[PDB]
Amino acid sequence: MNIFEMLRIDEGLRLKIYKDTEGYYTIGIGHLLTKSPSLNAAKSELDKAIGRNCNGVITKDEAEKLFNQDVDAAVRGILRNAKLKPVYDSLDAVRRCAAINQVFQMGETGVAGFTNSLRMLQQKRWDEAAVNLAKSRWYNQTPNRAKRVITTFRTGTWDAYK
Ligand SMILES: C=CCc1ccccc1O
Ligand SMILES: [Cl-]
Ligand SMILES: [Cl-]
Incomplete structure (x- = not known):
C-alpha cells in the first residue's frame, strides 16, 4: 500500500x-x-x-x-505551509499518507483550520485527534471515506484499506 x-x-x-x-x-x-x-x-x-x-x-x-x-502538488502544498509542515514531519509514514489524502481532498486551505487536530496529531494523541477530526463537516459529508482516513491516523496502519 x-x-x-x-x-x-x-x-x-x-x-x-x-x-x-x-x-x-x-x-x-x-x-x-x-x-x-x-x-x-x-x-x-x-x-x-x-x-x-x-x-x-x-x-x-x-x-x-x-x-x-496532483499528488505532487499536495505534498508540495503541505511542505509549503508553515502550520502543516511541522506536523507532517512529525508523523510516521503511514500517517503521512493520511495527511496527503485529506489535503488532496480538501485543499491546504480546508486542512489548515483543523488546528486542534493538528495540535493533537503533533502530540501523538491518536484517539483524541480521531474524535476531534470526526466533529467536522468533512466527516459528515463523506463518512465512509473520512472514517478510513481517520482510522489511518488513529492506528498508524493500513487496516482501513484492508
Ligand atoms: C488535520 C490535518 C492533518 C495534516 C497534517 C499535516 C499535513 C496535512 C494534514 O491534513
Ligand atoms: Cl496539468
Ligand atoms: Cl464516503
Whole structure:
C-alpha cells in the first residue's frame, strides 16, 4: 500500500467529466476541474490541463498523468505551509499518507483550520485527534471515506484499506 493506491481507492477513476460529491466538475482520479456549473467552463479547463481538445474525455495515461501531478502538488502544498509542515514531519509514514489524502481532498486551505487536530496529531494523541477530526463537516459529508482516513491516523496502519 501507498499513497497512489490509497487515493486510487478513495477517489475512483473516470475517463468522462463527472460531478463530485459536492457537485463539481471533475475527472480522472479525483481531478477537480472547476467550481463553476458551466460544463463548458469544465471542458475548456480539461483541454487546458491535458493539452488538447478532449471533448470531455480522456485516456488512462492522461488520467494518471494528472494524478501524478496532483499528488505532487499536495505534498508540495503541505511542505509549503508553515502550520502543516511541522506536523507532517512529525508523523510516521503511514500517517503521512493520511495527511496527503485529506489535503488532496480538501485543499491546504480546508486542512489548515483543523488546528486542534493538528495540535493533537503533533502530540501523538491518536484517539483524541480521531474524535476531534470526526466533529467536522468533512466527516459528515463523506463518512465512509473520512472514517478510513481517520482510522489511518488513529492506528498508524493500513487496516482501513484492508
Ligand atoms: C488535520 C490535518 C492533518 C495534516 C497534517 C499535516 C499535513 C496535512 C494534514 O491534513
Ligand atoms: Cl496539468
Ligand atoms: Cl464516503
